[PDB]
Subunit: 270 residues, 3 copies
Amino acid sequence: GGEVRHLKMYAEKLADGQMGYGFEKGKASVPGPLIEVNEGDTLHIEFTNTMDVRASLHVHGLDYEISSDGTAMNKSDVEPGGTRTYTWRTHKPGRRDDGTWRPGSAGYWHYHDHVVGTEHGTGGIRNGLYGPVIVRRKGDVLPDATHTIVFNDMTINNRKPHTGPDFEATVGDRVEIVMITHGEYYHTFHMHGHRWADNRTGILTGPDDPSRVIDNKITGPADSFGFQIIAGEGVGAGAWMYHCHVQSHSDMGMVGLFLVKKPDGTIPGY
Amino acid sequence: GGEVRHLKMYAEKLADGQMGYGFEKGKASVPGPLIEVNEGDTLHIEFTNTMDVRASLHVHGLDYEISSDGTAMNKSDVEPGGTRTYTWRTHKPGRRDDGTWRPGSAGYWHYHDHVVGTEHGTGGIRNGLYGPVIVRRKGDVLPDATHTIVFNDMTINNRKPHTGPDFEATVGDRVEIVMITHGEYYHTFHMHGHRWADNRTGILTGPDDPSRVIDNKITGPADSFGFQIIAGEGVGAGAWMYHCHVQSHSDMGMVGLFLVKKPDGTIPGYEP
Amino acid sequence: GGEVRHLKMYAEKLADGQMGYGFEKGKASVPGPLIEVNEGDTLHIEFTNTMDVRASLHVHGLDYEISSDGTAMNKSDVEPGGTRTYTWRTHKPGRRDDGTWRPGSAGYWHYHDHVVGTEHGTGGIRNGLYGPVIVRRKGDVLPDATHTIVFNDMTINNRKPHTGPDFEATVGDRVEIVMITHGEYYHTFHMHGHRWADNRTGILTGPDDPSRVIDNKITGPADSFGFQIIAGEGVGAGAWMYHCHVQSHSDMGMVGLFLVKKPDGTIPGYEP
Ligand SMILES: [Cu+2]
Ligand SMILES: [Cu+2]
Ligand SMILES: [Cu+2]
Ligand SMILES: [Cu+2]
Ligand SMILES: [Cu+2]
Ligand SMILES: [Cu+2]
Ligand SMILES: [Cu+2]
Ligand SMILES: [Cu+2]
Ligand SMILES: [Cu+2]
Ligand SMILES: [Cu+2]
Ligand SMILES: [Cu+2]
Ligand SMILES: [Cu+2]
Ligand SMILES: [O]
Ligand SMILES: [O]
Ligand SMILES: [O]
């Protein structure tokens, strides 16, 4: 509100047929790196496609002009080997001249390829071309740690079945989760031991906020949400599961651990 | 809040095998026409089934008595060539005698057949017997235009894959979308370049509204929601896609264009 | 709150192959029995597994320590014939020392098995090991009756197709529905003639609550919500259907009746 940030991104081929984004060449990951801005910021992303097929960057939520939408149709993708600057903007909330209220960009969002495999990025998303974006409102509560969980088709973060990811915290830590879904299937995200408000920030504003407090939520492709929890609050340390609650999904491997440790670094049991 | 209104409606079979509603014989559409009323209004719909099978009209949201629920079970459907008057009412919100708060009928709702093909209208809905209904609250912000997008099985508005529909606006217009899902599948509605509040009106009341601002929403059969956006607000003119984000669905043709024009009528990339 | 309460619970196998919980050996139901507490109450449940496989109780929403999470991994399940005391707590909302607002446990929750069939309770849930939990906030409005509707795979309350369940009320009654989904499938819960708020309690706090008012809602495995309605308000008596609105699901039997009676005990169309 409002810095003009410059940033580079690269799409790259990875082991085992995966593809991923990174801020630095040679350092792509699945999921892609978190991009975090404040409302009012502008972001110029100089994106380079280092792969042998056309590729792009498409973002949810943020204000971009049509030349930055990442589609073939608007000639907004990038040749093998090529480079292009995308521009994303964000805006603060406020009253319009007509007296109505402009929302503001703040929320939990995401970016992904829109052109690998099909004109809807089906091959790209499947291979790992997705990552999270957070836009903070002035005065939002900031966490001690942020974790990204993406349910992509039947995987978490494109991992093999039953291999996490796992995430560590300590009783009392303010932990932020960004939850994105991609692919063909619906899922239900569930965490043991912890709960959040079903609203923008995942936190209740005060006693007048009527939002449902939940610990389970249905999600479908390209849905994103986020929340903050206090690790172990009222429940203590432990190896706390998170998983998809669709029964065959969890049985086939969509399960991870939210390892909450005591101040001395132990977990009771595990 | 409240006028009594009278309105005629027809169910017709269409030459290609589909079925639609219309306010006039020979002017059936899919989706059926938009009905819009204020909280407190009553609506007497004189409905005529011009088809050779039994048909009905079932509405979500609004106050109807069991005789107007449109089901076979309640003797509420209509024989071939027959006519029946359905009555829908709406109420304003207010404090009840017990001190609790009665909601009010305002919202984005819909009507569809409940009897063609099966006793839950499976055949009717499939063929196109569905349409939108809006109930406004006093002081609601009104749009310039209202458009209806229905995901019905793997189609938008019962159209062939990759054939829209497309909508048009000029940068700055207040556009209202009513979004309905029907059939067997879950979908995920997404618009490029635009976003809305996940609450009743699609708009935030002011800075105290904690509702999520979104551009992508999961929906299932018979879900309806609506919102208003300012076309191109902060993003400018363009051929802005909307589509289902379930990857196979968009690949197989659930895609459309929201064409936002510069005040000179052009769209960046596509000069006429 | 806070009251400390003690409760006994049992898991039994049933002659048809199903499994259920109950407060008394020989009185297992599917859904299992309602447990209702106030925010701040602690609950000690003496759970005895009477089956020949290991079994557990896992709860959503409430505060439990890892030793009561009901999973194999944290050694929290129970051997055939064994007994174990689970402890569930609830807390009231309030300001934390960091000035942020702690939610409170109030809501519509549920409990289920986590170890029968697989280590996610797949077999247990399928067979019927599930039931509702309600946590009330001080000042919450209390209903006349609470009913539990659980869409478990393609069944309501594990029942055979087209066999309800049917609930009964009189025009004017304050009815509470707790709606839970389990299994592999998504559904959309729909009620004729009635509507509620998509928030914590299902009721609007007053005119500043921008929550969508709905009559249809998409749900997936382990989702729970609840609401209150005034039976027949603005619509009168009738055989009001509720069903899953996914067309093949209702056609194959996920249908029930909410029977709202006149003060003389009758339903329009179906007098005895
Ligand atoms: Cu797209
Ligand atoms: Cu899943
Ligand atoms: Cu759980
Ligand atoms: Cu997307
Ligand atoms: Cu209906
Ligand atoms: Cu119905
Ligand atoms: Cu779809
Ligand atoms: Cu997009
Ligand atoms: Cu319906
Ligand atoms: Cu679990
Ligand atoms: Cu269903
Ligand atoms: Cu569960
Ligand atoms: O997208
Ligand atoms: O329906
Ligand atoms: O769970």
